[PDB]
Ligand binder design. Structure first.
Ligand SMILES: Cc1cc2nc3c(=O)[nH]c(=O)nc-3n(C[C@H](O)[C@H](O)[C@H](O)COP(=O)(O)OP(=O)(O)OC[C@H]3O[C@@H](n4cnc5c(N)ncnc54)[C@H](O)[C@@H]3O)c2cc1C
Ligand SMILES: CC(C)=CCC/C(C)=C\CC/C(C)=C/CC/C(C)=C/CC/C(C)=C/CC/C(C)=C/CC/C(C)=C\CC1=C(C)C(=O)c2ccccc2C1=O
Ligand code: SF4
Ligand code: SF4
Ligand code: SF4
Ligand code: SF4
Lengths: 146, 92, 73, 73, 73, 92
């Protein structure tokens, strides 16, 4: 995304879509970003054709339109998103399988008096990860979502 | 009219000679009661307050028991219908 | 046989479905949906086969009491 | 189970919020979260905050999560 | 036309479905599912009707440059 | 065997006289590489490390580009196939 995209402009040259690495993959908006990036590049070149200049003085307006629109603001937002997800390996390793066994125990009726299912869920969540890991991970991801 | 379309779907054995919903005192329903919660909370539109008194269409009673409980003054002599009478819920 | 239990938050035009489908409830069931006239009529037949005399069409009005003043029937 | 949800419906009677604003607000928030209209995802993260802190104040949201916590015990 | 967007948390045997179905997406759509060989072939036909010459079966290897050293084709 | 059942579902125009996946140095794949990430991360089983060298079955290449990127030493001369060649995704 933001840390890895190229210069999206140059002398008589513009770069759109995934070639400029404009993808919000956590919201799955890549074609959202691509179809807009074509519109911003084509409106940049339509400015470049009435003036007749195609160098980096006029074609830098494409990079200005790219951050005045949603495309680069969605990239700045989830900038440190996958390096956040790489340094846990918990949100897809214990966290779904623990939320499934907790909600199964919540809906299972086996004569257990509903305080001993409210504590068996607590004995489920505070066994695969400590409470210093649960309350940390809710806001450690909060930095990834900004 | 509207809910008696849906009360026609239910199965009844009506006991017309034995009304199981009697009102103990009709004068409490005229001056002592303000909002008539037996009318506005009856799921079967059994109670209708006319100026002739209270019309108790006990034949459509679903035997829930709301009227006896929602009545603030206690003047609904509420019984279940007799055995083999009242609503007969098929696939209840 | 109930394998999925949803909770729906109805909006003006939308809904937030929060379900939980479990597939071990297909072979070890947790709950069934019933219609109680179909269930309690079958459940009466098992109670009748167990040896109890089920007496329908009969409303209990009060209790017959002995002279000790307790419920004797 | 009766001691646990003992003061449950008197808790629900003294709000009239969890079924009056709270579903219709969670539907408009999740609709705005999934609606794609060229709004740069910080101005949908604040339009959700301008949605949730308009029908009820933040002193009402953070109170109501644990005011119900006393109902769930 | 996408009217419901779910997020599923798959377990060992269960799933936590967290969906959101909206019915104003039936008449004012938010998103469609596509198959990109069917979409971009139709989208090429609209670009062709707009007046652009779409040249398939042709891979660009490099850029032809003028003596200023910039991309001239 | 297993994934070439699923590569049979795809449509190809194979350019057999022009392999678009060339390995720049076969000796880097023998001693310099430890885990061979081109083999273990290729979605189409194109690369197979035999002791005769690296078998590059470029005919099944899905043109994703993983091999060029996952290779730590850069010794995959990766090109797209020519125009009208390679995968031809129907309802892609
Ligand atoms: C599995 C998957 C699921 C996705 N789901 C979604 C989703 O739900 N929503 C969403 O918004 N985005 C989604 N995306 C992202 C989306 O596919 C891309 O971000 C975006 O559509 C790419 O647009 P593009 O213009 O770069 O086209 P691309 O398809 O990336 O490529 C443009 C074209 O360039 C051509 N080309 C390449 N090199 C040359 C060359 N040398 N000469 C000539 N032509 C060349 C190719 O043939 C290609 O057709 C998904 C991506 C993947 C992989
Ligand atoms: C009474 C009420 C509080 C009930 C709670 C119900 C709750 C689960 C949803 C509504 C509550 C609202 C008010 C919370 C505000 C913020 C919301 C929008 C956070 C979004 C995270 C989840 C829960 C979204 C719902 C599930 C479903 C609709 C997702 C659609 C699938 C795709 C399009 C989204 C992908 C996606 C995933 C999977 C993420 O994990 C994630 C994490 C952090 C930021 C963004 C994302 C994200 O975009
Ligand atoms: S509620 Fe009691 S008082 Fe009010 S109307 Fe019905 S019966 Fe008469
Ligand atoms: S019992 Fe239920 S239905 Fe019959 S009258 Fe009282 S409320 Fe109306
Ligand atoms: S990755 Fe580079 S080095 Fe390792 S095997 Fe494939 S080609 Fe040879
Ligand atoms: S391109 Fe994708 S498929 Fe073709 S070889 Fe490299 S990785 Fe395997």
């Amino acid at each position: 995304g933001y840390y890895a995209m190229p210069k999206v402009y140059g002398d008589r040259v513009l770069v759109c879509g995934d070639a400029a690495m404009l993808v919000n993959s956590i919201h799955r908006e890549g074609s959202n970003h691509a179809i807009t990036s074509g519109r911003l590049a084509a409106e940049t070149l339509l400015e470049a054709f009435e003036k007749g200049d195609f160098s980096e003085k006029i074609l830098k307006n494409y990079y200005l339109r790219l951050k005045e629109s949603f495309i680069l603001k969605d990239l700045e937002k989830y900038k440190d998103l996958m390096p956040t997800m790489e340094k846990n390996h918990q949100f897809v390793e214990i966290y779904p399988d623990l939320a499934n066994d907790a909600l199964k125990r919540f809906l299972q009726v086996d004569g257990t008096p509903k305080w001993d299912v409210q504590k068996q869920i607590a004995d489920m969540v505070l066994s695969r990860r400590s409470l210093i890991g649960i309350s940390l991970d809710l806001l450690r991801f909060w930095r990834a979502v900004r | 009219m509207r809910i008696e379309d849906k009360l026609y779907l239910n199965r009844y054995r009506t006991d017309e000679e034995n009304p199981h919903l009697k009102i103990k005192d009709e004068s409490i329903c005229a001056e002592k009661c303000s909002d008539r919660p037996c009318v506005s909370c009856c799921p079967a539109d059994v109670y209708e307050w006319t100026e002739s008194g209270m019309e108790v269409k006990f034949e459509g009673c679903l035997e829930c028991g709301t009227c006896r409980i929602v009545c603030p003054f206690g003047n609904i002599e509420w019984n279940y219908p007799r055995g083999n009478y009242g609503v007969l819920y098929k696939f209840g | 046989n109930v394998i999925e239990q949803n909770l729906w938050l109805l909006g003006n035009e939308g809904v937030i479905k929060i379900g939980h489908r479990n597939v071990e409830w297909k072979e070890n069931p947790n709950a069934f949906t019933v219609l109680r006239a179909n269930f309690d009529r079958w459940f009466a037949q098992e109670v009748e086969k167990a040896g109890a005399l089920i007496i329908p069409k009969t409303k209990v009005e009060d209790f017959l009491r002995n002279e000790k003043g307790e419920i004797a029937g």
